[PDB]
Enzyme design. Structure first.
Site, PDB file in Angstrom:
ATOM      1  N   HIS A 133       0.778  -1.317   0.065  1.00 51.36           N
ATOM      2  CA  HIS A 133      -0.171   0.117   0.043  1.00 51.36           C
ATOM      3  C   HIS A 133       0.686   1.266  -0.152  1.00 51.36           C
ATOM      4  O   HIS A 133       0.600   2.318  -0.685  1.00 51.36           O
ATOM      5  CB  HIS A 133      -1.080   0.139   1.031  1.00 51.36           C
ATOM      6  CG  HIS A 133      -1.638   1.169   1.553  1.00 51.36           C
ATOM      7  ND1 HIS A 133      -3.195   1.023   1.397  1.00 51.36           N
ATOM      8  CD2 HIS A 133      -1.493   2.409   1.901  1.00 51.36           C
ATOM      9  CE1 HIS A 133      -3.761   2.488   1.893  1.00 51.36           C
ATOM     10  NE2 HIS A 133      -2.623   3.122   2.173  1.00 51.36           N
ATOM     11  N   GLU A 134       1.879   1.510   0.808  1.00 50.85           N
ATOM     12  CA  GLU A 134       2.756   2.529   1.011  1.00 50.85           C
ATOM     13  C   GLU A 134       3.369   2.680  -0.359  1.00 50.85           C
ATOM     14  O   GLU A 134       3.511   3.781  -0.888  1.00 50.85           O
ATOM     15  CB  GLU A 134       3.783   2.520   2.239  1.00 50.85           C
ATOM     16  CG  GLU A 134       3.102   2.337   3.376  1.00 50.85           C
ATOM     17  CD  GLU A 134       2.074   3.379   3.831  1.00 50.85           C
ATOM     18  OE1 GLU A 134       1.792   4.545   3.310  1.00 50.85           O
ATOM     19  OE2 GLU A 134       1.214   2.868   4.813  1.00 50.85           O
ATOM     20  N   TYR A 164      -4.680  14.286  -2.069  1.00 52.08           N
ATOM     21  CA  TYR A 164      -4.912  13.321  -1.009  1.00 52.08           C
ATOM     22  C   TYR A 164      -6.206  14.095  -0.284  1.00 52.08           C
ATOM     23  O   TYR A 164      -5.987  14.624   1.009  1.00 52.08           O
ATOM     24  CB  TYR A 164      -3.662  13.175  -0.317  1.00 52.08           C
ATOM     25  CG  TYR A 164      -3.827  11.946   0.620  1.00 52.08           C
ATOM     26  CD1 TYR A 164      -3.805  10.769   0.104  1.00 52.08           C
ATOM     27  CD2 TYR A 164      -3.547  12.288   2.051  1.00 52.08           C
ATOM     28  CE1 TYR A 164      -3.935   9.655   0.664  1.00 52.08           C
ATOM     29  CE2 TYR A 164      -3.694  10.947   2.939  1.00 52.08           C
ATOM     30  CZ  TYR A 164      -3.824   9.977   2.284  1.00 52.08           C
ATOM     31  OH  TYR A 164      -4.223   8.742   3.050  1.00 52.08           O
ATOM     32  N   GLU A 188      -6.473   6.205  -1.985  1.00 57.16           N
ATOM     33  CA  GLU A 188      -6.454   5.402  -0.735  1.00 57.16           C
ATOM     34  C   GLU A 188      -6.928   3.868  -1.341  1.00 57.16           C
ATOM     35  O   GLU A 188      -6.315   2.913  -1.046  1.00 57.16           O
ATOM     36  CB  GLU A 188      -7.442   5.988   0.306  1.00 57.16           C
ATOM     37  CG  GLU A 188      -6.568   6.484   1.320  1.00 57.16           C
ATOM     38  CD  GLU A 188      -5.357   5.625   1.883  1.00 57.16           C
ATOM     39  OE1 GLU A 188      -5.655   4.858   2.469  1.00 57.16           O
ATOM     40  OE2 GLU A 188      -4.149   6.357   1.828  1.00 57.16           O
ATOM     41  N   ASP A 246     -10.206  13.445   8.519  1.00 54.25           N
ATOM     42  CA  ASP A 246      -9.335  12.518   7.522  1.00 54.25           C
ATOM     43  C   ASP A 246      -9.180  13.152   6.320  1.00 54.25           C
ATOM     44  O   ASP A 246      -9.339  12.300   5.006  1.00 54.25           O
ATOM     45  CB  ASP A 246     -10.129  11.141   7.520  1.00 54.25           C
ATOM     46  CG  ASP A 246      -9.542   9.769   6.809  1.00 54.25           C
ATOM     47  OD1 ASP A 246      -8.077  10.101   7.079  1.00 54.25           O
ATOM     48  OD2 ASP A 246     -10.180   8.933   6.159  1.00 54.25           O
ATOM     49  N   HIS A 275      -9.383   7.512   3.948  1.00 53.58           N
ATOM     50  CA  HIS A 275      -9.611   6.269   4.429  1.00 53.58           C
ATOM     51  C   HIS A 275     -10.911   5.664   4.632  1.00 53.58           C
ATOM     52  O   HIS A 275     -11.110   4.475   5.069  1.00 53.58           O
ATOM     53  CB  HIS A 275      -8.895   6.236   5.663  1.00 53.58           C
ATOM     54  CG  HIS A 275      -7.429   6.648   5.599  1.00 53.58           C
ATOM     55  ND1 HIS A 275      -6.967   7.856   5.759  1.00 53.58           N
ATOM     56  CD2 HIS A 275      -6.412   5.681   5.304  1.00 53.58           C
ATOM     57  CE1 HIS A 275      -5.732   7.743   5.434  1.00 53.58           C
ATOM     58  NE2 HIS A 275      -5.363   6.483   5.107  1.00 53.58           N
TER      59      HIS A 275
HETATM   60  C1  LIG Z   1      -1.505   2.431   9.317  1.00 55.61           C
HETATM   61  C2  LIG Z   1      -1.829   3.844   8.454  1.00 55.61           C
HETATM   62  C3  LIG Z   1      -1.876   5.025   9.118  1.00 55.61           C
HETATM   63  C4  LIG Z   1      -2.110   6.380   8.472  1.00 55.61           C
HETATM   64  C5  LIG Z   1      -2.004   6.227   7.071  1.00 55.61           C
HETATM   65  C6  LIG Z   1      -1.755   5.117   6.522  1.00 55.61           C
HETATM   66  C7  LIG Z   1      -1.962   5.109   4.821  1.00 55.61           C
HETATM   67  O1  LIG Z   1      -1.068   4.465   4.524  1.00 55.61           O
HETATM   68  O2  LIG Z   1      -2.802   5.743   4.184  1.00 55.61           O
HETATM   69  C8  LIG Z   1      -1.792   3.895   7.044  1.00 55.61           C
HETATM   70  O3  LIG Z   1      -1.746   2.585   6.579  1.00 55.61           O
HETATM   71  C9  LIG Z   1      -2.766   2.245   5.877  1.00 55.61           C
HETATM   72  O4  LIG Z   1      -3.800   2.833   5.963  1.00 55.61           O
HETATM   73  C10 LIG Z   1      -2.618   0.728   5.456  1.00 55.61           C
HETATM   74  C11 LIG Z   1      -2.298  -0.340   6.598  1.00 55.61           C
HETATM   75  C12 LIG Z   1      -1.433   0.130   5.274  1.00 55.61           C
HETATM   76 ZN   LIG Z   2      -2.736   5.155   2.366  1.00 54.83          ZN
END
Ligand SMILES: Cc1cccc(C(=O)O)c1OC(=O)C1CC1
Ligand SMILES: [Zn+2]
Ligand SMILES: [Ca+2]
Ligand SMILES: [Ca+2]
Ligand SMILES: [Ca+2]
Ligand SMILES: [Ca+2]
Length: 316
Positions: A142-143, A157, A166, A226, A231
């Site tokens: 994801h990252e 974003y 997202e 958010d 998200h």
């Molecule tokens: C854990 C987390 C917190 C904040 C942003 C993200 C983000 O990457 O948007 C994030 O990771 C995720 O959403 C999924 C688990 C990888």
């Molecule tokens: Zn993300």
């Protein structure tokens, strides 16, 4: 660093042993020279200055508990590279084999992971909400997908383009999980979320509502938290993508599934050829329908399923 390529061994966050590509120059560093211009993993040493220090180890064995997040961030960045190269013919996130950098042990008890515009960053979790977040391959992928999106569609974003941003990261995070074939699912984060609780996750693509996210446009969030629900509202698109791949009947609208490979082809094409920084959901529908038309023809099942899926989640 300049050095010679070698192969170390260690255990990841979940206690699994795996081999990792390293570079030897006095110390053994978490530098994989076999992928593009390198994958490099750094220790932030519980601080917030980035990237921190390139990870060095005296003996090329990475079995310490402190090593585990580094082993996984490094390893899963490699698996993600492989996914994009082998499945979409894309070389790293910029398509020109850019060096992939990750830092682990970011801050203290930190329950997030993110792409900061230049690199991936993983907290260790506080031990209750999360364990070290690079322990999930869908988290790492994801990252790194945030980097792909930034180099391609550049979805802002915020609000609907942010929720698409997202969802794209959740979709390719999940497709990489499936590519690696270890306990794959359509949930996000299950391997590192709430060690005290089994069977949950941060988000679900197959039933977003189970963790409070909408599965229909009519239930979209319109407030400002958010970044405008990025998200949250990503659940609407995640649901559509789940239906396109696996099919199902949702609020009475049936979708014939066409499988994950075709899902990935259609969304990769929309991402790289049609979406723009301010695309909204309706525009995503258009981009996915056109991508599918490009790939399989306007009268194909694939096109029909994309339309049905967007219809099922109330997106016209
Ligand atoms: C854990 C987390 C917190 C904040 C942003 C993200 C983000 O990457 O948007 C994030 O990771 C995720 O959403 C999924 C688990 C990888
Ligand atoms: Zn993300
Ligand atoms: Ca060691
Ligand atoms: Ca899984
Ligand atoms: Ca998962
Ligand atoms: Ca859990």
């Amino acid at each position: 660093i300049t050095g010679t390529s070698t192969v170390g061994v260690g255990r990841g966050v979940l206690g699994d042993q795996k081999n990792i590509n390293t570079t030897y120059s006095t110390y053994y560093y978490l530098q994989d020279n076999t992928r593009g211009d390198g994958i490099f993993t750094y220790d932030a040493k519980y601080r917030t200055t980035l990237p921190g220090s390139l990870w060095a180890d005296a003996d090329n064995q990475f079995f310490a508990s402190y090593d585990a997040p580094a082993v996984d961030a490094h390893y899963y960045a490699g698996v993600t590279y492989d996914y994009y190269k082998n499945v979409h013919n894309r070389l790293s996130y910029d398509g020109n084999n850019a060096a992939i950098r990750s830092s682990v042990h970011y801050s203290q008890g930190y329950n997030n992971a993110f792409w900061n515009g230049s690199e991936m960053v993983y907290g260790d979790g506080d031990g209750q909400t999360f364990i070290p977040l690079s322990g999930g391959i869908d988290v790492v992928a994801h990252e790194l997908t945030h980097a792909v999106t930034d180099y391609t569609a550049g979805l802002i974003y915020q609000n609907e383009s942010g929720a698409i941003n997202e969802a794209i990261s959740d979709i390719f995070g999940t497709l990489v999980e499936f590519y690696a074939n270890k306990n794959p699912d359509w949930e996000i984060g299950e391997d590192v979320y709430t060690p005290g609780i089994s069977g949950d996750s941060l988000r679900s693509m197959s039933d977003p509502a189970k963790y409070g996210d909408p599965d229909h446009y009519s239930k979209r969030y319109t407030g400002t938290q958010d970044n405008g629900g990025v998200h949250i509202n990503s659940g609407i698109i995640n649901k559509a993508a789940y239906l396109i791949s696996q099919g199902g009947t949702h609020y009475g609208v049936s979708v014939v599934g066409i499988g994950r490979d075709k899902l990935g082809k259609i969304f990769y094409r929309a991402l790289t050829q049609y979406l723009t920084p301010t695309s909204n959901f309706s525009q995503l529908r258009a981009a996915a329908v056109q991508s599918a038309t490009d790939l399989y023809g306007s009268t194909s099942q694939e096109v029909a399923s994309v339309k049905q899926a967007f219809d099922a989640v109330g997106v016209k």
